[PDB]
Design an enzyme around this catalytic site. Structure first.
Site, short mmCIF file in Angstrom:
data_model
loop_
_atom_site.label_atom_id
_atom_site.label_comp_id
_atom_site.label_asym_id
_atom_site.label_seq_id
_atom_site.Cartn_x
_atom_site.Cartn_y
_atom_site.Cartn_z
N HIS A 91 -2.12 2.05 1.62
CA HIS A 91 -1.13 2.75 1.11
C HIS A 91 0.21 2.14 1.81
CE1 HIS A 91 -3.70 6.10 -0.12
NE2 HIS A 91 -4.56 5.64 0.42
N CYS A 133 -0.41 -3.42 4.72
CA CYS A 133 0.45 -2.31 4.71
C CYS A 133 1.31 -2.26 6.19
CB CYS A 133 -0.14 -0.72 4.92
SG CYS A 133 -1.31 -0.74 5.90
#
Lengths: 219, 213, 222, 220
Positions: A91, A133
């Site tokens: 994410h 990320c």
């Protein structure tokens, strides 16, 4: 001797497509994050099945299960298989602990399939697709694919998924069977890079491959 | 859109081939080192001229000259050129200061040609071939040796040799990254024989790369 | 089995490029004919040498010499060779007798290199490039038949600089000879010639009886 | 000029795959003939649908219907289509009248889609797959594919189909979307060529390209 040499993809099984979901140290989980990640997994599962892969999905939430499964993939025989694929999805917000865990997970994953640790895949392509990320992982017949180069922007996940995984999945659908893989990845490079007007998201791949890579359909 | 899209290689000039010789902090200079390095430079200069490049050679010894030259390559206009190449050659023994200076030199070289710093090459391929010792769209990073692999003469170095060989034979025929992959196999088996030890390239290219005449 | 299999091009020699000049029953030889033919020959000799071929040139004028030479190319061993190439060049006006002699000459040439008559080339490509002035010749395995012009289409005039077809072919060979698979290269020639302008299109053609891919990557001195 | 230019395959429709059964003037119809022909048609209908084609099948028995249908495929608009395909299937033995009618049928079929007669297909590939039982059609962007080269053997029809159509159909299944079409046809050349009495002979198929670009049947 031969400028056209290819990895032999005529084994009984194509191989395993490992889709790994990095979810353990993330906290604010907006629906865009959650739905978009599902979109990226689902999409990748479709594309990779169609190329012959056994897709296996798990996340790092289930601390007890990641032990078992991770162990299984490494030890199992790949003698009757062409190649190995591993997709690492993550994410965007990423706290530092989440970000740090990511690196350690990727370091372990990749380390499992070095020829010294895994004879059944020696001389067979190991392809890692890493949603960052942008790193330094090694090995002959390794192919390292990164959602984003060192110090480039990375757009927020959407409910539809992520630019990189989407665009990759697109190319796989259209050209999976046709193109040599690194050519196909170059298409993903241009597609994503053309998706504070920061100039671009420019993905990357690092090849330690010694032959050509084609996913012509099997019998 | 088009799975076969190519960088437009029809400009007036092919481009500059910059051959950079790193030798400032080296003290143990056996003839194998010095003659082999000449072998790598001379060989690379032939191969790259044959592909149409303006080959320019300097080293980091003349601290005065590098300033001038390095400045020129960056500032000059590349609007009438296809691509840019840069080879960074370095010796094997390598002390720590020498090793450290290498990283810095590479860091700067590459940094000069990011679109942010060099409009004339925007959308054009920038190819860095880096002989290791120890980012950017349309950048191609080629390394003599992957992270934590072994990397070893009077006639030259396995990597630069094999590269040069492939360039002589397939420079005009093959797509560049496919040509690099041949270099991958060639070197990784040269080592196995004389003695894994696998070179590497990192592509941020968006199109195909051909050195048609 | 393997969708990418290639004819093995790693023999000691590339092979012979035979360039055959059909001149015998022609009467009016304007300079455009005479110079344009030389241009096609010289151009094709350059391009085929660059791809490794032993170029051999003769015409059908010397009726004694054609007997010897033609027999030489047939009987000689090609075991250490990749393939065989034959270009048949002709003139545009063409009297009936000249045209007719063409057909017979092509029949014989092609017939010499069928596996039935020529063991040394069995399994190796036999490429005939034919500047038409028969098209049923098309018989053999590993044969590649390339024609300046399809059935009942216009053919370019000959000019002092050569012929649209041989020109364009030679151009592609220069730029793409070592790069592209040959039929891919021929398809380029298809588009180039068919878009030559100077109302009629000329549409070239090739007939493949090839079983593998054809590449002319540069060879090893070794 | 671009050494990799492709026919634009991004139209609304892929196009028509016309499968034409030459039946009239054939007398002895052993079950291998009849069953093998159905096999070839059905197999080709599967393979061509899978690449996006509208498959249409008719034979020349229904003398009234061939008039209509043949006229339809010619006159209809193809502006929103990529290409046109036409397979001509025949039986091996072939009396001379049957053989002769074949040539005439093929001559007319091909003639309909020359750019002179059919504007909607101009610049679009016209691919004819011809099971032979002369070799004189023509046109730019035409692809002529033959079961068998001039004066070579053709293996008899079987209950499971014919070597050529079988092998073609196999490659289409496996490589239809992947490979450039002529590359795929070359695979058919090798398969059939490499393929219980009176035979030591080989069958060598052929194709004639008047194509100007590359041909790919990537999924739509």
């Amino acid at each position: 001797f031969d400028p056209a040499e290819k990895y032999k993809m005529d084994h009984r099984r194509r191989g395993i497509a490992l889709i790994f979901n990095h979810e353990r140290f993330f906290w604010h989980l907006t629906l865009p994050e959650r739905r978009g990640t599902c979109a990226d997994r689902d999409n990748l599962t479709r594309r990779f099945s169609d190329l012959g892969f056994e897709v296996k999905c798990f996340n790092d939430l289930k601390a007890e299960e990641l032990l078992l499964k991770i162990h299984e993939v490494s030890t199992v025989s790949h003698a009757d298989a062409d190649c190995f694929v591993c997709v690492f999805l993550s994410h965007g917000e990423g706290n530092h602990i989440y970000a740090y865990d990511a690196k350690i997970e990727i370091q372990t994953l990749t380390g499992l399939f070095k020829g010294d640790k895994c004879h059944s895949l020696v001389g067979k392509p190991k392809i890692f697709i890493i949603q960052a990320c942008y790193t330094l992982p090694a090995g002959a017949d390794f192919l390292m694919c990164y959602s984003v180069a060192e110090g480039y922007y990375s757009h927020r996940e959407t409910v539809n998924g992520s630019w990189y995984i989407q665009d990759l999945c697109e190319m796989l659908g259209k050209y999976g069977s046709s193109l040599e893989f690194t050519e196909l990845l170059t298409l993903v490079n241009r597609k994503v890079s053309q998706r504070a007007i920061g100039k671009k998201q420019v993905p990357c791949f690092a090849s330690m491959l010694t032959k050509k890579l084609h996913f012509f359909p099997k019998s």
